[PDB]
Structure formats: C-alpha cells, structure tokens
Ligand binder design. Sequence first.
Ligand SMILES: Nc1ncnc2c1ncn2[C@@H]1O[C@H](COP(=O)(O)OP(=O)(O)NP(=O)(O)O)[C@@H](O)[C@H]1O
Ligand SMILES: Nc1ncnc2c1ncn2[C@@H]1O[C@H](COP(=O)(O)OP(=O)(O)NP(=O)(O)O)[C@@H](O)[C@H]1O
Ligand SMILES: [Mg+2]
Ligand SMILES: [Mg+2]
Lengths: 632, 646
Amino acid sequence: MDVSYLLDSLNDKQREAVAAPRSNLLVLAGAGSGKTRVLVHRIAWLMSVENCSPYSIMAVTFTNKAAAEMRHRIGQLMGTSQGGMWVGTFHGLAHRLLRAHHMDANLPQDFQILDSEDQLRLLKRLIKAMNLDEKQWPPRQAMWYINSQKDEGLRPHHIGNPVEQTWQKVYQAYQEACDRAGLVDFAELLLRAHELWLNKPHILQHYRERFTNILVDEFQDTNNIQYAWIRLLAGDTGKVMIVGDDDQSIYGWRGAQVENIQRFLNDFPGAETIRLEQNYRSTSNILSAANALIENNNGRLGKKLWTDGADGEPISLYCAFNELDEARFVVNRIKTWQDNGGALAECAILYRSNAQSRVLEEALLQASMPYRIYGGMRFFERQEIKDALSYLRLIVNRNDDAAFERVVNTPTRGIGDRTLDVVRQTSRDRQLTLWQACRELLQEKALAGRAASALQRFMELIDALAQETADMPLHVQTDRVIKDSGLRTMYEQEKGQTRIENLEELVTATRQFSLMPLQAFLSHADTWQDAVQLMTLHSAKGLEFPQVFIVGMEEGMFPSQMSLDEGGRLEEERRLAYVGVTRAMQKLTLTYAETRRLYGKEVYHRPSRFIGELPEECVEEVRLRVSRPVQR
Amino acid sequence: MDVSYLLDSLNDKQREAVAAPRSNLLVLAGAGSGKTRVLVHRIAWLMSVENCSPYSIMAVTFTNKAAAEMRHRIGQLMGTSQGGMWVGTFHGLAHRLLRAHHMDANLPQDFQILDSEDQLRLLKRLIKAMNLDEKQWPPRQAMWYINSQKDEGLRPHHIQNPVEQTWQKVYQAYQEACDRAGLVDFAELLLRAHELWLNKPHILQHYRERFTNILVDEFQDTNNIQYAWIRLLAGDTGKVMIVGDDDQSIYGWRGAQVENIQRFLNDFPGAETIRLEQNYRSTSNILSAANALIENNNGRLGKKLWTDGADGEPISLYCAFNELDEARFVVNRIKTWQDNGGALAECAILYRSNAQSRVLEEALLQASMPYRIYGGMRFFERQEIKDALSYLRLIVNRNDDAAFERVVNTPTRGIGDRTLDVVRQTSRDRQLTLWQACRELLQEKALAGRAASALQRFMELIDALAQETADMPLHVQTDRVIKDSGLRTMYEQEKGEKGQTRIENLEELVTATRQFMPLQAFLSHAALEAGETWQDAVQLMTLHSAKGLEFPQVFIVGMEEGMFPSQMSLDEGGRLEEERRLAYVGVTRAMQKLTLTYAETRRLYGKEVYHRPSRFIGELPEECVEEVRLRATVSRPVSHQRMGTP
DNA sequence: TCGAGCACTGCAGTGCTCGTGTTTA
DNA sequence: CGAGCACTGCAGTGCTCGTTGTTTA
Ligand SMILES: Nc1ncnc2c1ncn2[C@@H]1O[C@H](COP(=O)(O)OP(=O)(O)NP(=O)(O)O)[C@@H](O)[C@H]1O
Ligand SMILES: Nc1ncnc2c1ncn2[C@@H]1O[C@H](COP(=O)(O)OP(=O)(O)NP(=O)(O)O)[C@@H](O)[C@H]1O
Ligand SMILES: [Mg+2]
Ligand SMILES: [Mg+2]
C-alpha cells in the first residue's frame, strides 16, 4: 500500500523501473544490483498506484529456486495477500494451463509427467523395438535430439537430411508411444501449452485478457519456446517487464541464447532498457573479483557495477590434499562460522556437478553438521521410490507404459524378458499400450502356459489394488500399495535398508502434503532446521549467502572436461564462475584438490584458470599452522 | 540212504542214468521226462553208493528259478542236511569264487556288481567323453557288443575293418573304467572267474580236487564262456553229468547255442548219451499239443515223448476284447479253480515279456487275489531304490562311478551340468575316477565359486554318512542314509500323485534289510529269494523264467502275432524257430490244464493296435483245443441274396 | 505310453566395460 | 569406481519322437 514504503529503499534507476508507466521494459544489470528487488516492488506498484488486479499478474522464471525467491520476497513485502497472481516456473505454469485445459490439449485429464530416467528408458525400448542397434543410434543421443527439437518447438512433421531422417523417425515413434500412453515429458509441457494458444484463439484471448501484466526473472535463461510463449501471451495488449544479465547466461546447452534479450527489444511494442549500476550484495573484494573474472570474456559490453561497501575479508583459496581433505576443510570452516554465532543456512557449498556432493555429504555427516542438498526432484529418482510410485501410476492409468514396464516383474513374479518381448512387439505391431497388448494376448491364448498365468496374476493384482484404495487418502493408499506389491518384503531382504526408510518417508511426505492426489503430489516438491546449503552452481543463481564455498576449482571439473573438449563452451563456464563468485555476501572460499579419484584412477588436475583470473589483492592463500617429540 | 528208494520211482532209462558208473554222461530228453529228477537222484546215488562227499558235488544251472528248483528237490530227497554242496547259477557260483579270491582275481574286497541299467548309463558317459556321435555309436548297440564279446570270453585284444577297431576301443575304454571304479558287470563274472583258473593253476588244482562231481541242469542254456568254465573245472579228472533238451534252446540271443551238446560229446572223456522218452508231467492232450507244435521246426532227430496219462481237459482258448479283459478272464478262471479247492500257487500266468505283467497285476489287485510276480531283481532297479543304494555304494567305495553320477546332484546339490562336464574330462584325461578327479580339482582350486561351494558340501556329506553310520546294522543304516541324504524329503514332496508309492518302496527297502560286505551280500540274498513264502499266491513270470518249472494250471497270455512271435523275431528269420521253442516250453509247463488267450486289441506304445492271433495257436491239434465261446448258439447260416444293388 | 534328450524360460551370481554435465512437475 | 550388461550356470516346464525282448547278484 503505502507507496512511500515501496520507494524508500530503491535508488535512482531502481525507482525509475518500479515507478514507471505501464510499458514493456527490460532491466539489464549485473549480479546483486537489485533486479529481483525491483521486479518484486514493481508488482506491488502495479497493484497500489496503477490499481491493477492481482489476477492480471504473472511472475515467471525458469528454475524452482528463482521462482521460490520471487514468491518469497513477494510475501515479505505484500504479506501473501497475493492470492490470485501466478508465480511459478515456465514448466510449472505450462503444466497448470495444460491440466485445466487437457481437452483442447488432446491430453487425458490425468496425464502423467515423464521425467528423464523414464524418458531415457522409454527411448531405449522404443529403439530396441524399431530394430536399431544401441551403439549406432544411442538412446541418450535420441533423447537429446528429441528434447532439442521441442526446445525449438519443432514437431516431427516440421522436419532432405542425412542420417538424421532416421532420428526424425524415432522422434515420431516416441510421440506416438507417449500420446497413446498418456505421457508428457518436460519439453512437451512447454510445446503443448504453446500450441494450445495457437489453436484455441478463444483460450488465448481469455488469458491475454487476464494476464495484462507479465514479469520474468533471470530472463537470459529463457529458451526459444519459452520466449515465444511469452511474446504470444503478451501480444500488443500485455505489458511486460523482463530483467536479467547477459553475463549470467548459462543454459546454452538447452536453447537459451543471449539474443533473446535484444530480441525482446525488437519484438515487444515500445520496448526500452533500464540499466542498474549499483551492487548491494557483496563486499568490494568479491565484486572486484567478479568484474575481473567476467572481464575475461569477449564481446560483452562493459557495464561494471560498483559498491559503497568496504573491501571486506579476502577470498580464501585453499589447496586441499584430495577430495576428502577438501570436504573436511570446508566443514571445518563452517563450524568456526557456527561457533561464532553464524547460521549454518547462511553457508552454501557449491559445486559444478552433483557428483561432487557425495564426498561433502559424508564429511558433513561425519561431523554431525545438518545440511540440505538441493538435488531438486531427485528423491523420486531413487530406485525404490520410482517403483512404489509406479504401482500408484498404474492404479491411475494402465496405459502408463513407463510404469507398466518398471514393475510388471518387480518384485520378480515369473514374467521374464521372453514373455515381454512378445507383449512389447504386440504393442509395436498393433499400436497398443503395453497393457492393451496383454489384454489381447491373454484373450487370445497366444501366451505360453505358466506364462499367460503369471501375466494374468499380475493384471489381477494391479486392478485389485485399484479397488482396495479407491477410497483411501493418498497418505494411506501409498502405504497399502507399498506393502501389497511386496516392494517392502522384496527390499528388506536384500542385505547390501536405508533404501526402505525412504519408502516409509515417501508415506509421510504424501501424508503431510497440501483430481488432487493424481499429479498434485509428484508435482509440488520442514525448512525451519538450520542447515548447510549444498547445490550446483547452476541452482545457486538468483540466490545469495553470507558464506560461500565453491569446491573442485580445477581444470576438468570447473571448467568441466566437456566444455574443455568441445572448446567453445568456455566463456559460458566463465559466466557460471561469475555466478558462483557473485553469490557470496561476506566471505568467498574456493578450494581445489591436488588429487582426486575419478573412474577409479588417481588424477592430478591442474588448478582452474578461474582462480588465476582473480585479482591477487582479493585473494589470500590459506596457509595452515608441534606434536610430542619422537618403546617396543 | 536206502538205495531201494532212490530207484523205486525211476523207469528203465532213468535208472541207467542214476545207477551208473562215475563217468561223463549226457541225458537228452523232452520236457517233463524226469531229467531234473534223474539229476537230483544221481546226487543221492553219488553220495550213498559212490560214498562221495557232499563237498565234492556242484549242481549248476543258468536261471535262479531252475537252480532254486534243484535246491528244493535235493532238500526233499536228502533232507536239507547236505554239507558243503554247491547249488546255484553260473553267475552266482562265478560270483562266489571271485569273492573268496578277489586278490588273485585282481578285484578289491568290495567290487560292486554293475547291473544292466548302470552298465548302459556308464557307457553313455564314456561314449560322450570320447567325443563320439551319440547316434553314430548307440550306447545300447555298444552294450550289446561288449557283452557278446564277454559271452565268448574275448577281451579288447580281439582284432582283424574300421567299425571293428572303434567298438574295440569303446570296449577297452569301458573295461579300464570299471577296473578303476572296481565295478563288475554280469558278463565280467563268468570271464573273470574263468581267467582266475587260467592264471592261478594252483587255485584250479584245489577245485578240481574238490568238485569231482559236476551236474548241470538245462544244459542247452550254457553259452561259450560257461561251457569253457565247465570243461575247465572238469579237466581230465572230473565226472560230469549234463541234462537238457535241444528243443528248449531259448537263449541264442546270449550265446547258448545247440552245438555245446555235441561239443560235450566230443570234448569230454568217455562222454555217452542216454535218452529218456516217457513224460510224467502233462496230460495226453497237453503233450499231443506240444509235440504237434514242436514238429513245425526243421532239423529235428525226432525225439520220442509219450505218456500213459488220460487225455485230460482240453486246452482252453480265449479271445479277449482287450488286454484288461484278458486279465479279468484269467482271474475269473483262477477263481473257479480256487473256489473248488485248488491253490493259487498251482496257477501260473505266463507271458512273453515283462511289460505284459502290469495289467495282470492291476486285475489281480482289483480282485484281491494274492499273486507273486517273479521279476527277480527289478525292485532295486526302481528309481527311488537305485538312488537310495547309490549312496550306500559310495559309502563303500568312493570310486563307484555309476553311483557317484546318480546321487551327485540328487537331490539337486547345485552341482549342475557344466560343473560335471569338467570333472568328466578331469577323469577321461587324468585317467582317474569321478571322486578322485574331484578331490584333486579342490586342493587345486580350478573351479568357480558357487561351483566348488556345493561340490564340496557333497564330498563332505557322503564322508559324513560313512563315518556316522559306520557301526550300526544295515537296516537302520539304510534308514539314516535315506533321510539324511534328502531323498526321504525329496520323494516326500515331488508329486502327490505317483510319488505316493515311491516313498513306500523306500520303506519296503528298509523292511527288506531288517529281515536279513552286507550291502553287496544283501543284493545276493534277494537274487535267491527272487525264486520261490508259502502264503498261497498266483505265480506270474515270463516263459523264459518258467522253463524248468511246472504247475497244475497254466495261462499263457498275449498269444498274438507281434507279441509272440514278438515282432522283432519275425525280422531275423532264424529267431522264429526259437519262439516256437519258447512256445513249446510254455505248453509243456502245464500239468492238468492249459489255457491260451489273446486280445482283439491292446494299446502298445500309446496306440490301439489290432493283432492277429498267434500262428502257434493254429499249429496245435484241433482235437486238443476247445475255444471259449462268446455266444450261445452257432451263427445261423444265411443264404445268398441276388442283389446287383452295389 | 512315457522316459530320456532338446529347446525354452526365468533367475542368480560374475567378471568386463566404460562414462548425465548443468534443469524441468 | 560403480551402474549396466553380457555371460555362465542351475532349475523347472512343455515337447517330440522314438520306443524295440528274454536273464544274470
Ligand atoms: N536499494 C537497495 N538498498 C539495500 N539493499 C538492496 C537494494 N537493492 C537490492 N538490495 C538487496 O541487495 C541484494 C541483491 O539483490 P537482488 O535483487 O537479489 O539482485 P539481483 O539483481 O536479482 N542479482 P542476480 O540474480 O545475481 O542477477 C539483496 O539482498 C537485496 O535485498
Ligand atoms: N519215474 C517217475 N515217476 C513219477 N513221477 C516222475 C518220474 N519222473 C519224473 N517225475 C515227475 O514228473 C515231473 C516232470 O519231471 P522233471 O524232472 O521236472 O522233468 P524235466 O525232464 O526236467 N523237464 P523240463 O525241465 O521241462 O525239460 C515232475 O513232477 C517229477 O516229479
Ligand atoms: Mg536476482
Ligand atoms: Mg527239468
């Protein structure tokens, strides 16, 4: 309300952005200059000065992390009276639109989302089916190919070419398998929803009417299908605010090209730019490091932020003996921080790839220090969880090929490979769902003796649980199914436990969760406990922390080897470095190991070039500081 | 004792053979003329008149039933009390020798006898290990070879063609294998024992000095290695008596050739023939039939065979509508005989092959009619029994290949196929046994993890049973081996169908031992006992096993072309006159009444076949046979009807 | 008939081979 | 190094296809 409390903190350029006329505006600026602060306040202003309805406001961005930040800051300022405005990820909002419109979207109301592992598998089987050798046409290669097409909003038909006309064939097969199965992968969510507004002008006209105010954070993350989606939703009616930093462009590998920025200026009516120039997040030391670091990339522009702040502590650089010594030294410095009254949560440990988290996790455990690893939607990746959730999915729909496959013979119940190759082929040949094929092959006797009887048993079971829990609440249904499938019995007696604990926790998760049950759960997914924050440098973008530790600062790790090999992704790695550095508020610490063990082999990586690119006066090497003098 | 009685019964020619000087004599005569009587009485004569020692008399024959038959008449004439007199079969006495002289024979003090089944199985393994094609050298066709050779006395040596040299090798391979394992097959008993005298003159001496009185019944049963064995023991000092009938020569398939009767006349010092002619067993009708029947074979010096007896009842002839009806028909006839005071034991149901006894049994069981099937050693051939004994055999000699195989993975010990394929090689190459080739590959760790894990558990288990039941008697010793080997629990589950009587046989095997080198000696007691327990029961056995015996009522079933004469016999040509001789034997077992039956149809090897009655039936004299009528009046003669109406 | 030999199928244990890398409900 | 196979091996379940007969401890 009190417009005065909206403008008090803001500086010149921020004010101009927040208190501007309703127009298409781009706020371009480096890290920690208040772009997100601006976007959030701009929402408050659209509401009290321009008296705009909360319903006409869509705040969207790419990662869950960044969306949560927006969502969070929007609460602190407007005490969650926001009820009405849409604040989420592109995928999230796309999902939302496709659910409530599955009809014009040619999607069965209870469509299932196909994640990576599930997509990877459906592709394997689909290729092995099409009678194609795994090594000549690798599954992953097909996934990348397919997702890439959708990232560009290209359907199979849209595409005279070489040995990709075949890939173009696998793509088409895949679509068919998914549609028939009622599955939708991530890339699909965005593409479908876009098509939605292209073939249902009345639905589009509806939204253009509702969402007159569109705001996008971390804009340089948006790829082509996402850009189009927004340009479309805006038309000539919508007024949009995009904020970003081309220096933090780190999703090239998924279609997000820097150009989408200048593109916005060319495409949206009367588009204009506002440039923030003052950093408020970090000490002068960190910021000078950042600027120097980014300054190594070519082209760019040269905006350079500045700060009143004092130099502050230096950037710590510790050369660990190996990956264990690395984790240990980090956990050590966090303790000191804690012992002097610092919150664990005010500390983040950042790495280039998730693989690096295991060693850190063990050191943290080994020191009884609480922590959170944001593998964002990874708990449901764990074998046991994917299995449990698969029975449920079948219960929801038998056509969930992905689900049918994962447990038809898990736990083992006769139904072996042979029996299945028959069923699979049936689906391939008669264009049916794995369950649809079984339906027939049974009422056709075609199956063997103990064979058609093992399959019969199963199908009786799946349908059996779909009755017993057709009343029970998701929290108890997820309990019964787990025991009545033998998943419990089968896991317990495995030797190698912690695995079964997760199943029980899944029960609790479903238990304390906000038709509904359907997706509602698997989708949306206890923070009061102070804990150390662990996440990839990519996920950290948009976030900030008082104490920041970036591990694995070595050539081959960061910059990753891939980037090093196909020598072209290096300015992007340096931009990711920039992200990492600009995340630190008070203290930044970078560590690297003289030796670590990868693919069972000791390697001695050279120190990352990024460490050297930092100004010597901001970096201070960590030097460590007798034991009793030296019977039988 | 009182000579007077040893001769009172006898007729002219019988007397001349019984009360004759100690010399080599041959009594050649038709069936039921008293040859066996003569032979038994000769013994008493050689004992009271010639004052010979019972220890000097050896009465030998080929079949257990025939031998058992002598054993009985001897004991009835001289009162069991007959010192150390040897009465048994060739193989049996041959066995008794090799046992009391294993060292000189070169056999372990426990050599195990390899029956027809194991022998064939052992040949399988062996044939594979030589990478020889399974159907290029059939193991069956191999067993037939080796044995035929031994029947002659030949050893691997035999040479003089490609095929020849092959088998020759298979043969030798086999021999060696047995010697290692310490296994002896039936043919090995006769050949080894023969050799034992050719290779131990002092030993032979001992026996020639002991058995100066040799008597053989059913001589025409002797083949070459058996003739040799006798000519030997007799040398130039022994006095032998052989009795037989060339018309009852029914073992050509195993060497026993008619020639041996002349050979005896040529090779034995003083040899002389005595011919009997009066039959005392059968009714005139029955004899008239046997005679008419045998005359159809060519090349017969025309043996006498007459009788004072009345005509007696006709030969009953019955055409059944199927095999089961045939059984119930016999059971019906035997029942009428029993209901009139006759004894079931005076009734024999004879047949061409053993398979034919299954339906008879079912019928008798169904009628609650006590019957005994003289199958011989076919109880220990049964699966559950073979296994149970395969264990005990290993406990008495780890080198028992035959055994080791069988029980190694039974009950499933994890020791699967390939695991053995190797040990099989570890033996074909190393030149060891299966247990020796195993104890090696262990303290040599040349086998996988899961593999050697169990293959050791096995090795250990048998050794455990050996050292655990080493004391206790045989009957309880068997009770432990059975249960503690898993078998008790194995055959316990498995079916819940036919696996029911399978476990009860293992119990009967326990009883058999309770009512008794124990293990090997156990098997011999059974071979005897397998030949006549006076609890009135109908007798079932083959026409072969019956030769030598007699019964008031006889029933020959399966008088069908393709059964008797068996199909095969029809191919070889010369086998046919042998079948007619087997038919002669059959007819001549009947004392009072004979009944022949044949089925309109029967299912052989899952197929409803339709045979024509056996030619042997028509060969009999019509005035000797009365067919069992299946209808009251004779089919009224119907005149011809002029109809050009197709 | 039906038992041994052959192909089929499922499941458990084993060396041999070789590489998500970042996000998305 | 460790998930993923490709392999080897033991078992259990239809099948066919092929059968041959007598005795011996
Ligand atoms: N005018 C201001 N006075 C005081 N604090 C401010 C001001 N503007 C922004 N901040 C704070 O400065 C920090 C950085 O702001 P933030 O809005 O997160 O930057 P950003 O531009 O979104 N960075 P990035 O996501 O890295 O591109 C936050 O802690 C804000 O709360
Ligand atoms: N002189 C006799 N007086 C009375 N009964 C006799 C006489 N001779 C033999 N028998 C009996 O006649 C039957 C047949 O005798 P047996 O000695 O068995 O004949 P066999 O010549 O051995 N016949 P086979 O073995 O078939 O070639 C038996 O019941 C004898 O007990
Ligand atoms: Mg921001
Ligand atoms: Mg006789």
